[PDB]
Amino acid sequence: FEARRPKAKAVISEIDGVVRIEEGEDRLSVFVESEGFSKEYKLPKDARLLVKDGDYVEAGQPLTRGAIDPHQLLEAKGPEAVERYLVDEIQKVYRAQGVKLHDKH
């Protein structure tokens, strides 16, 4: 509700690229490169990523596990998916606890 930066924050692609895993036994970095673009992502060897090498990615798609920063995916995927993930998580915890309520609210 406060759109605060997650503690466990997970990285997300900024475009629709291809995946390239690169690990020099220091930093496990995963590049995401398009046809006319490219950018890498500095990632720690600890948190396991969700995308296997060579795979195709989508805009704002999560590369690693953990909560997604609201503003981050906002300027990536779009406002549509934003609303979605927001309410989806709130209902995640609420439904988990065993309290049902309409999404409208």
Partner: protein, 105 residues
């Protein structure tokens, strides 16, 4: 936020699939009853709906039986997406509308 215009007059909407993909299990599954019941009950269709031979007129309000029918229609595999008027898409300014809101619970 107050209901002012009974109809804002927008065309926008959001679809809400009844299928939430199970993680580590891959294969998609139907959102258990309470989940769907909490999203489609007291709603208003944004567009026409065809499946199982019965037709849902655009602008038809939903009740328990309605959402249950959609559930069955999903299980049969005739529908997945659910076009509805959301409080978000609502163009009512400084408030909301009827069609975009729903049933007074």
């Amino acid at each position: 936020i107050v209901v002012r215009e009974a109809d804002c007059g927008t065309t926008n909407y959001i679809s809400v699939p009844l299928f939430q993909m199970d993680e580590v299990t891959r294969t998609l599954r139907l959102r258990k009853r309470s989940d769907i019941e909490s999203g489609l009950y007291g709603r208003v269709l944004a567009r026409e709906v065809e499946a199982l031979g019965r037709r849902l007129e655009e602008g038809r309000y939903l009740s328990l039986e309605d959402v249950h029918f959609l559930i069955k229609a999903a299980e049969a595999g005739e529908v997945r997406e659910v076009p509805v008027r959301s409080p978000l898409t609502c163009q009512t300014r400084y408030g909301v509308c009827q069609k975009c809101y729903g049933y007074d619970l």
